[PDB]
Protein backbone atom coordinates (compact mmCIF):
# COMPACT_ATOMS: atom_id res chain seq x y z
CA UNK A 1 0.00 0.00 0.00
CA UNK A 2 1.57 3.28 -1.12
CA UNK A 3 -0.18 6.64 -1.31
CA UNK A 4 -0.08 8.60 2.07
CA UNK A 5 -3.37 9.89 3.54
CA UNK A 6 -1.88 13.37 3.24
CA UNK A 7 -1.78 12.84 -0.55
CA UNK A 8 -5.22 11.12 -0.62
CA UNK A 9 -7.06 13.68 1.50
CA UNK A 10 -5.09 16.84 0.71
CA UNK A 11 -6.85 19.32 -1.62
CA UNK A 12 -5.29 20.30 -4.91
CA UNK A 13 -1.73 20.92 -5.99
CA UNK A 14 0.24 19.48 -3.10
CA UNK A 15 3.72 20.96 -2.76
CA UNK A 16 6.05 18.08 -3.25
CA UNK A 17 9.03 17.46 -0.91
CA UNK A 18 9.11 17.96 2.82
CA UNK A 19 8.89 21.56 4.00
CA UNK A 20 6.52 23.28 1.60
CA UNK A 21 4.23 20.22 1.97
CA UNK A 22 4.57 20.52 5.74
CA UNK A 23 3.47 24.17 5.79
CA UNK A 24 0.70 23.74 3.20
CA UNK A 25 -1.00 20.93 5.11
CA UNK A 26 -0.31 22.55 8.44
CA UNK A 27 -3.27 24.60 7.31
CA UNK A 28 -6.45 22.69 8.30
CA UNK A 29 -8.12 24.35 5.24
CA UNK A 30 -6.17 22.28 2.62
CA UNK A 31 -7.96 19.04 3.48
CA UNK A 32 -11.17 17.61 2.10
CA UNK A 33 -13.99 18.63 4.46
CA UNK A 34 -14.75 15.11 5.74
CA UNK A 35 -11.06 14.72 6.58
CA UNK A 36 -10.97 18.14 8.22
CA UNK A 37 -13.94 17.05 10.37
CA UNK A 38 -12.18 13.84 11.39
CA UNK A 39 -9.16 15.95 12.37
CA UNK A 40 -11.35 18.17 14.52
CA UNK A 41 -12.97 15.25 16.20
CA UNK A 42 -9.65 13.54 17.05
CA UNK A 43 -8.08 16.75 18.36
CA UNK A 44 -11.13 17.39 20.55
CA UNK A 45 -10.86 13.87 21.95
CA UNK A 46 -7.08 14.22 22.61
CA UNK A 47 -7.64 17.64 24.14
CA UNK A 48 -10.32 16.40 26.53
CA UNK A 49 -7.96 13.56 27.61
CA UNK A 50 -4.99 15.92 28.05
CA UNK A 51 -7.14 18.25 30.21
CA UNK A 52 -8.20 15.31 32.31
CA UNK A 53 -4.54 14.49 32.87
CA UNK A 54 -3.68 18.08 33.72
CA UNK A 55 -6.53 18.51 36.23
CA UNK A 56 -5.57 15.21 37.88
CA UNK A 57 -1.90 16.18 38.12
CA UNK A 58 -2.71 19.65 39.51
CA UNK A 59 -5.19 18.25 42.09
CA UNK A 60 -2.33 15.94 43.26
CA UNK A 61 -0.18 19.04 43.80
CA UNK A 62 2.04 18.81 40.68
CA UNK A 63 3.29 22.21 39.54
CA UNK A 64 3.13 22.86 35.78
CA UNK A 65 5.38 20.19 34.30
CA UNK A 66 6.39 18.75 30.93
CA UNK A 67 6.81 15.03 31.61
CA UNK A 68 9.12 13.77 28.85
CA UNK A 69 9.54 10.03 28.43
CA UNK A 70 12.69 9.58 26.35
CA UNK A 71 13.94 6.36 24.87
CA UNK A 72 13.92 3.98 21.93
CA UNK A 73 11.00 1.90 20.61
CA UNK A 74 9.85 -0.97 22.83
CA UNK A 75 12.28 -0.36 25.66
CA UNK A 76 9.64 -0.70 28.40
CA UNK A 77 8.84 3.00 28.56
CA UNK A 78 5.19 2.55 29.56
CA UNK A 79 5.96 0.24 32.39
CA UNK A 80 8.55 2.69 33.78
CA UNK A 81 6.12 5.64 33.50
CA UNK A 82 3.51 3.67 35.39
CA UNK A 83 5.71 2.37 38.16
CA UNK A 84 8.23 5.18 38.57
CA UNK A 85 6.12 8.35 38.07
CA UNK A 86 3.32 7.65 40.60
CA UNK A 87 1.61 11.09 40.08
CA UNK A 88 1.41 10.55 36.32
CA UNK A 89 0.39 6.90 36.79
CA UNK A 90 -2.61 8.15 38.80
CA UNK A 91 -3.50 10.55 36.03
CA UNK A 92 -3.11 8.08 33.13
CA UNK A 93 -5.41 5.71 35.01
CA UNK A 94 -8.26 8.22 34.61
CA UNK A 95 -7.83 8.47 30.80
CA UNK A 96 -6.89 4.82 30.16
CA UNK A 97 -3.55 6.08 28.98
CA UNK A 98 -4.76 8.72 26.58
CA UNK A 99 -3.81 12.38 26.38
CA UNK A 100 -0.01 12.27 25.73
CA UNK A 101 1.69 14.05 22.84
CA UNK A 102 2.73 11.34 20.44
CA UNK A 103 1.72 10.96 16.71
CA UNK A 104 1.10 7.28 17.20
CA UNK A 105 -1.99 7.95 19.37
CA UNK A 106 -3.86 9.13 16.19
CA UNK A 107 -2.89 6.25 13.90
CA UNK A 108 -5.49 3.61 14.67
CA UNK A 109 -8.31 6.24 14.24
CA UNK A 110 -6.82 7.67 10.94
CA UNK A 111 -6.17 4.15 9.59
CA UNK A 112 -9.83 3.12 10.22
CA UNK A 113 -11.26 6.49 8.94
CA UNK A 114 -14.53 5.78 10.86
CA UNK A 115 -15.08 2.91 8.48
CA UNK A 116 -15.00 0.17 11.10
CA UNK A 117 -11.81 -1.51 9.90
CA UNK A 118 -8.15 -0.63 9.37
CA UNK A 119 -7.70 0.11 5.71
CA UNK A 120 -4.55 2.21 5.66
CA UNK A 121 -1.16 1.08 7.00
CA UNK A 122 0.68 2.87 9.79
CA UNK A 123 3.15 4.30 7.28
CA UNK A 124 0.26 5.53 5.13
CA UNK A 125 -1.15 7.51 8.09
CA UNK A 126 2.16 8.68 9.67
CA UNK A 127 2.53 12.12 8.08
CA UNK A 128 -1.06 13.01 8.90
CA UNK A 129 -0.72 11.69 12.51
CA UNK A 130 2.44 13.87 12.81
CA UNK A 131 0.54 16.98 11.60
CA UNK A 132 -2.19 16.22 14.22
CA UNK A 133 0.31 15.72 17.06
CA UNK A 134 1.88 19.08 16.15
CA UNK A 135 -1.47 20.81 16.17
CA UNK A 136 -2.38 19.07 19.45
CA UNK A 137 0.95 20.08 21.00
CA UNK A 138 0.55 23.67 19.75
CA UNK A 139 -2.85 24.02 21.42
CA UNK A 140 -1.44 22.60 24.71
CA UNK A 141 1.51 25.04 24.82
CA UNK A 142 -0.48 27.73 26.70
CA UNK A 143 -3.36 25.63 27.76
CA UNK A 144 -4.59 26.41 31.29
CA UNK A 145 -6.46 24.41 33.93
CA UNK A 146 -9.55 25.62 35.86
CA UNK A 147 -7.21 27.44 38.30
CA UNK A 148 -5.65 29.43 35.48
CA UNK A 149 -2.34 27.52 35.91
CA UNK A 150 -0.50 26.23 32.80
CA UNK A 151 -1.50 22.64 32.18
CA UNK A 152 1.02 19.79 32.72
CA UNK A 153 1.59 17.73 29.58
CA UNK A 154 3.26 14.50 28.63
CA UNK A 155 5.60 14.11 25.62
CA UNK A 156 5.95 10.48 24.76
CA UNK A 157 8.45 10.34 21.83
CA UNK A 158 11.92 8.94 21.32
CA UNK A 159 13.40 12.39 21.92
CA UNK A 160 16.75 11.10 20.68
CA UNK A 161 18.44 14.25 19.24
CA UNK A 162 19.87 17.44 20.69
CA UNK A 163 17.60 19.63 18.54
CA UNK A 164 14.49 17.95 19.86
CA UNK A 165 15.62 17.98 23.50
CA UNK A 166 16.53 21.69 23.10
CA UNK A 167 13.14 22.53 21.59
CA UNK A 168 11.25 20.91 24.47
CA UNK A 169 13.47 22.56 27.05
CA UNK A 170 12.71 25.91 25.37
CA UNK A 171 8.98 25.18 25.36
CA UNK A 172 9.18 24.35 29.06
CA UNK A 173 11.14 27.46 29.89
CA UNK A 174 8.80 29.70 27.83
CA UNK A 175 5.68 28.37 29.49
CA UNK A 176 6.98 28.11 33.10
CA UNK A 177 6.92 24.26 33.17
CA UNK A 178 9.46 22.09 34.91
CA UNK A 179 10.79 19.17 32.85
CA UNK A 180 10.43 15.79 34.51
CA UNK A 181 12.42 13.48 32.18
CA UNK A 182 12.61 9.69 32.54
CA UNK A 183 14.99 8.18 30.01
CA UNK A 184 14.60 4.45 29.47
CA UNK A 185 17.14 2.17 27.74
CA UNK A 186 17.17 -1.45 26.69
CA UNK A 187 19.70 -3.34 24.48
CA UNK A 188 18.88 -3.14 20.80
CA UNK A 189 17.89 -6.85 20.67
CA UNK A 190 15.37 -6.29 23.46
CA UNK A 191 13.69 -3.56 21.37
CA UNK A 192 13.66 -5.89 18.35
CA UNK A 193 11.92 -8.68 20.20
CA UNK A 194 9.66 -6.08 21.84
CA UNK A 195 8.54 -4.94 18.39
CA UNK A 196 7.84 -8.55 17.16
CA UNK A 197 5.68 -9.10 20.30
CA UNK A 198 3.48 -6.12 19.49
CA UNK A 199 0.29 -7.39 17.83
CA UNK A 200 -1.29 -5.65 14.75
CA UNK A 201 -4.57 -5.56 16.60
CA UNK A 202 -2.86 -3.46 19.26
CA UNK A 203 -2.11 0.18 18.83
CA UNK A 204 1.66 0.06 19.62
CA UNK A 205 3.81 0.75 16.58
CA UNK A 206 5.60 -2.05 14.64
CA UNK A 207 8.39 -0.34 12.75
CA UNK A 208 10.97 -1.97 10.51
CA UNK A 209 14.56 -2.60 11.54
CA UNK A 210 16.22 0.65 10.44
CA UNK A 211 13.87 2.70 12.64
CA UNK A 212 14.77 0.68 15.74
CA UNK A 213 18.54 0.52 15.10
CA UNK A 214 18.92 4.12 14.04
CA UNK A 215 16.69 5.07 17.08
CA UNK A 216 19.04 3.09 19.35
CA UNK A 217 22.11 4.74 17.99
CA UNK A 218 20.62 8.25 18.27
CA UNK A 219 19.23 7.77 21.78
CA UNK A 220 22.46 6.36 23.18
CA UNK A 221 24.83 8.86 21.41
CA UNK A 222 22.93 11.92 22.58
CA UNK A 223 22.14 10.72 26.11
CA UNK A 224 24.93 12.48 27.95
CA UNK A 225 24.01 15.80 26.28
CA UNK A 226 20.54 15.50 27.86
CA UNK A 227 22.07 14.66 31.26
CA UNK A 228 24.43 17.68 30.96
CA UNK A 229 21.39 19.97 30.57
CA UNK A 230 20.12 18.91 33.97
CA UNK A 231 23.56 18.94 35.56
CA UNK A 232 24.04 22.54 34.30
CA UNK A 233 20.59 23.87 35.33
CA UNK A 234 19.09 22.52 38.63
CA UNK A 235 15.95 24.65 38.09
CA UNK A 236 15.12 22.83 34.79
CA UNK A 237 13.55 19.84 36.60
CA UNK A 238 14.71 16.29 37.23
CA UNK A 239 16.27 13.54 35.11
CA UNK A 240 16.39 9.72 35.79
CA UNK A 241 17.90 7.11 33.49
CA UNK A 242 16.72 3.49 33.74
CA UNK A 243 18.65 0.68 32.02
CA UNK A 244 18.11 -3.01 31.63
CA UNK A 245 19.98 -5.57 33.69
CA UNK A 246 20.78 -9.04 32.30
CA UNK A 247 17.57 -10.52 33.66
CA UNK A 248 15.45 -7.95 31.96
CA UNK A 249 14.73 -5.89 35.12
CA UNK A 250 14.95 -2.13 34.86
CA UNK A 251 17.35 -0.49 37.27
CA UNK A 252 18.28 3.08 38.01
CA UNK A 253 21.57 3.95 36.31
CA UNK A 254 22.09 7.74 36.74
CA UNK A 255 20.01 10.70 37.98
CA UNK A 256 19.94 14.44 38.45
CA UNK A 257 17.37 15.18 41.15
CA UNK A 258 17.06 18.55 42.90
CA UNK A 259 20.33 19.37 41.18
CA UNK A 260 22.13 16.43 42.65
CA UNK A 261 23.91 14.13 40.18
CA UNK A 262 24.58 10.51 41.05
CA UNK A 263 25.53 7.37 39.15
CA UNK A 264 23.63 4.46 40.69
CA UNK A 265 25.12 1.89 38.30
CA UNK A 266 28.43 2.93 36.78
CA UNK A 267 28.86 -0.28 34.71
CA UNK A 268 25.53 0.20 32.98
CA UNK A 269 26.21 3.93 32.63
CA UNK A 270 29.42 3.19 30.72
CA UNK A 271 27.49 0.78 28.49
CA UNK A 272 24.24 2.66 27.73
CA UNK A 273 25.84 5.93 26.70
CA UNK A 274 27.49 4.27 23.69
CA UNK A 275 25.97 2.61 20.60
CA UNK A 276 28.59 -0.25 20.59
CA UNK A 277 29.16 0.12 16.87
CA UNK A 278 31.94 -1.45 14.67
CA UNK A 279 33.06 -0.69 11.12
CA UNK A 280 30.88 -3.50 9.51
CA UNK A 281 28.83 -5.17 12.38
CA UNK A 282 25.36 -6.35 11.35
CA UNK A 283 22.76 -7.51 13.82
CA UNK A 284 20.25 -6.85 10.98
CA UNK A 285 21.49 -10.06 9.30
CA UNK A 286 21.39 -12.27 12.41
CA UNK A 287 18.99 -15.15 11.83
CA UNK A 288 16.29 -15.98 14.43
CA UNK A 289 17.02 -19.66 15.19
CA UNK A 290 16.44 -22.05 18.06
CA UNK A 291 19.51 -21.00 19.99
CA UNK A 292 18.73 -17.24 19.64
CA UNK A 293 15.24 -17.99 20.95
CA UNK A 294 16.73 -20.08 23.80
CA UNK A 295 19.44 -17.41 24.41
CA UNK A 296 16.71 -14.79 24.94
CA UNK A 297 14.50 -17.11 26.89
CA UNK A 298 17.45 -17.97 29.27
CA UNK A 299 17.27 -14.44 30.67
CA UNK A 300 13.56 -14.18 30.98
CA UNK A 301 12.18 -15.75 34.24
CA UNK A 302 8.54 -14.39 34.16
CA UNK A 303 6.18 -17.06 32.56
CA UNK A 304 3.82 -14.75 30.67
CA UNK A 305 6.68 -12.62 29.26
CA UNK A 306 8.73 -15.69 28.35
CA UNK A 307 5.77 -17.32 26.48
CA UNK A 308 4.94 -14.14 24.53
CA UNK A 309 8.58 -13.62 23.58
CA UNK A 310 8.85 -17.16 22.39
CA UNK A 311 5.70 -17.17 20.32
CA UNK A 312 6.57 -13.86 18.64
CA UNK A 313 10.06 -15.12 17.74
CA UNK A 314 8.94 -18.56 16.50
CA UNK A 315 6.60 -16.87 14.07
CA UNK A 316 9.67 -15.47 12.28
CA UNK A 317 12.09 -18.37 12.85
CA UNK A 318 14.61 -18.71 10.02
CA UNK A 319 14.40 -15.00 9.10
CA UNK A 320 17.02 -12.33 9.81
CA UNK A 321 16.01 -9.66 12.33
CA UNK A 322 15.72 -7.23 9.35
CA UNK A 323 13.42 -9.64 7.41
CA UNK A 324 11.38 -10.46 10.56
CA UNK A 325 10.68 -6.86 11.46
CA UNK A 326 10.02 -5.89 7.81
CA UNK A 327 7.38 -8.68 7.55
CA UNK A 328 5.92 -7.83 10.98
CA UNK A 329 5.72 -4.19 10.12
CA UNK A 330 3.79 -4.88 6.84
CA UNK A 331 0.80 -6.42 8.69
CA UNK A 332 -2.30 -4.24 9.13
Amino acid sequence: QRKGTDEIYGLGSLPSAGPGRWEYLANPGNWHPERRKLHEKLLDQARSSALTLAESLESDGCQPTLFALRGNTATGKTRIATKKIPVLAAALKKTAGKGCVNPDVFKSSLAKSETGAKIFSSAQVHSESSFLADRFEGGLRSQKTGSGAIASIVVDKRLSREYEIDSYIQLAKETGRKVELCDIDAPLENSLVGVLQRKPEGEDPRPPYPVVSSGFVAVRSNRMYVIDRFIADPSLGNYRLFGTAEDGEKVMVASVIGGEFSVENAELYEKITSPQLSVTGDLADKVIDKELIDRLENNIADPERAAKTRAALEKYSGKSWSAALAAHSELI
Partner: protein, 98 residues
Amino acid sequence: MKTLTGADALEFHKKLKERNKALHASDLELALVHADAVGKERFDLEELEKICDTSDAGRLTDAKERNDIYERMYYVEYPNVMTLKEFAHIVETLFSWS
Protein backbone atom coordinates in the same frame (compact mmCIF):
# COMPACT_ATOMS: atom_id res chain seq x y z
CA MET B 1 26.80 -1.77 43.06
CA LYS B 2 27.75 1.19 45.26
CA THR B 3 26.33 4.58 44.01
CA LEU B 4 28.87 7.12 42.84
CA THR B 5 28.05 10.44 44.44
CA GLY B 6 29.37 13.99 44.54
CA ALA B 7 32.78 14.56 43.01
CA ASP B 8 33.27 10.85 42.09
CA ALA B 9 30.06 10.95 40.10
CA LEU B 10 31.00 14.12 38.35
CA GLU B 11 34.55 12.84 37.51
CA PHE B 12 33.13 9.51 36.22
CA HIS B 13 30.71 11.43 33.97
CA LYS B 14 33.48 13.78 32.73
CA LYS B 15 35.87 10.88 31.87
CA LEU B 16 33.06 8.86 30.26
CA LYS B 17 32.17 11.85 28.06
CA GLU B 18 35.80 11.98 26.88
CA ARG B 19 35.74 8.22 26.16
CA ASN B 20 32.56 8.37 24.18
CA LYS B 21 33.69 11.50 22.27
CA ALA B 22 36.85 9.54 21.20
CA LEU B 23 34.71 6.60 20.21
CA HIS B 24 32.32 8.93 18.29
CA ALA B 25 35.14 10.53 16.31
CA SER B 26 36.86 7.13 15.75
CA ASP B 27 33.78 5.36 14.42
CA LEU B 28 33.44 7.96 11.64
CA GLU B 29 37.26 8.02 10.89
CA LEU B 30 37.39 4.31 10.45
CA ALA B 31 34.14 4.22 8.48
CA LEU B 32 35.49 6.82 6.04
CA VAL B 33 38.62 4.69 5.43
CA HIS B 34 36.51 1.66 4.76
CA ALA B 35 34.16 3.64 2.49
CA ASP B 36 37.09 4.90 0.41
CA ALA B 37 38.43 1.34 0.05
CA VAL B 38 35.15 -0.14 -1.19
CA GLY B 39 34.31 2.88 -3.43
CA LYS B 40 31.20 3.94 -1.55
CA GLU B 41 29.63 7.01 -3.13
CA ARG B 42 30.89 10.20 -1.46
CA PHE B 43 28.28 11.70 0.87
CA ASP B 44 26.58 14.74 -0.67
CA LEU B 45 23.72 16.27 1.24
CA GLU B 46 22.31 18.38 -1.67
CA GLU B 47 21.99 15.40 -3.96
CA LEU B 48 20.39 13.28 -1.20
CA GLU B 49 17.82 16.09 -0.59
CA LYS B 50 16.70 15.95 -4.21
CA ILE B 51 15.36 12.51 -3.59
CA CYS B 52 14.08 12.46 0.03
CA ASP B 53 13.14 14.91 2.73
CA THR B 54 15.68 15.29 5.56
CA SER B 55 13.99 18.17 7.32
CA ASP B 56 12.00 16.32 10.06
CA ALA B 57 8.97 18.34 9.03
CA GLY B 58 11.08 21.58 8.79
CA ARG B 59 12.22 21.07 12.40
CA LEU B 60 15.84 20.84 11.02
CA THR B 61 16.54 24.20 9.47
CA ASP B 62 20.32 24.15 10.08
CA ALA B 63 22.71 22.31 7.77
CA LYS B 64 25.39 21.86 10.49
CA GLU B 65 23.29 19.50 12.63
CA ARG B 66 21.75 18.24 9.41
CA ASN B 67 24.83 17.37 7.39
CA ASP B 68 26.40 16.09 10.59
CA ILE B 69 23.43 13.83 11.39
CA TYR B 70 23.04 12.26 7.90
CA GLU B 71 26.67 12.02 6.80
CA ARG B 72 27.50 10.23 10.01
CA MET B 73 24.46 7.89 9.67
CA TYR B 74 25.48 7.22 6.04
CA TYR B 75 29.03 6.21 6.84
CA VAL B 76 28.81 4.76 10.40
CA GLU B 77 25.39 3.14 10.53
CA TYR B 78 25.03 1.96 6.97
CA PRO B 79 28.49 0.82 5.84
CA ASN B 80 27.09 -1.65 3.28
CA VAL B 81 24.95 1.04 1.61
CA MET B 82 27.02 2.08 -1.44
CA THR B 83 24.97 4.93 -2.88
CA LEU B 84 22.99 7.94 -1.88
CA LYS B 85 20.07 6.55 -3.76
CA GLU B 86 20.04 3.56 -1.56
CA PHE B 87 20.42 5.78 1.49
CA ALA B 88 17.52 7.90 0.45
CA HIS B 89 15.20 4.99 0.78
CA ILE B 90 16.49 4.49 4.26
CA VAL B 91 15.91 8.10 5.26
CA GLU B 92 12.35 7.92 3.79
CA THR B 93 11.71 4.79 5.92
CA LEU B 94 12.98 6.59 9.05
CA PHE B 95 10.53 9.39 8.54
CA SER B 96 7.54 7.07 7.98
CA TRP B 97 7.61 5.98 11.66
CA SER B 98 7.84 7.69 15.09
